[PDB]
């Protein structure tokens, strides 16, 4: 996260760490949607261009973390993935369209002060909060500079108009994405960065006070550059894919 802050203890109880067994290392961010399911960017799994193609056995999921690096002894819980599900129409070939994936943990995780799921948005929550101008919050243990933080970082970013979004890049922007960041005039910064991927873009609902997961950190050009924005998977646009797998693979 670029130009963010040290998260407070239990500020983001849904943040997960996608951690590689060997070498032991932080792959990406993710989020707990229930005691058995994790949500991430498919590109954290699969990415042929870089010879990336992790299996269930190549990873570890770590929930309850604050500290980037230390093993937080009675606070964190490590899990073994049971299954991996990548959107069947994820586009690694052109724009990272549909960069979503689900993870079935091998045994449910017990909730605690530091571990608690985030709510998936319904058609109306989506419709009333997803408005340019509205701020959302991103989290992660990714680079601080377009370096590796000590503690979980947080940043609040305003949502940007589709058009401003399209004109800041040459990449083809689909309806499954949304961009965020401040405008250069706004003179306020912050962004996600390498290693931030898969983390949640969340919003607090003013109707019922619940945290909602609207986006998934997906991609961007550089990190915190004027005239450039962060791009996120639109969690609501793909809710039917999500609904559809939780009840076949059955969460």
């Amino acid at each position: 996260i670029v130009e963010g802050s040290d998260a407070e203890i239990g500020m983001s109880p849904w943040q997960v760490m996608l951690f590689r067994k060997s070498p032991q290392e932080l792959l990406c961010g993710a989020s707990l949607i229930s005691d058995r399911w994790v949500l991430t960017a498919a590109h954290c799994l699969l990415y042929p261009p870089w010879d990336k193609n992790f299996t269930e056995n190549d990873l570890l999921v770590r929930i309850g973390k604050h500290s980037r690096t230390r093993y937080e002894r009675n606070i964190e819980k490590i899990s073994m993935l049971e299954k991996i599900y990548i959107h069947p129409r994820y586009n690694w070939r052109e724009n990272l369209d549909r960069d979503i994936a689900l993870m079935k943990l091998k045994k449910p995780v017990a909730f605690s002060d530091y571990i608690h799921p985030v709510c998936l948005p319904d058609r109306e929550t989506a419709a009333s909060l997803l408005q340019a101008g509205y701020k959302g919050r991103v989290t992660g243990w990714g680079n601080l500079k377009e370096g590796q933080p000590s503690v979980l970082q947080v940043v609040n970013l305003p949502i940007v108009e589709r058009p401003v979004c399209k004109d800041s890049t040459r990449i083809r922007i689909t309806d499954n994405m949304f961009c965020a960041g401040y405008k250069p005039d706004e003179g306020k910064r912050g962004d996600a960065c390498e290693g931030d991927s898969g983390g949640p873009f969340v919003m607090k609902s003013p109707f019922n006070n619940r945290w909602y997961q609207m986006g998934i950190v997906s991609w961007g050009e550089g990190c915190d550059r004027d005239g450039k924005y962060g791009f996120y998977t639109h969690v609501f646009r793909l809710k039917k894919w999500i609904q559809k797998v939780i009840d076949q693979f059955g969460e």
């Binding site: 067994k21 032991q24 290392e25 932080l26 570890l60 690096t69 093993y71 490590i78 073994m80 590796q148």
Partner: peptide, 10 residues
């Protein structure tokens, strides 16, 4: 700088 993890995890 990663601390190792209980082996019951690997």
């Amino acid at each position: 700088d990663f601390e190792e993890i209980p082996e019951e995890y690997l």
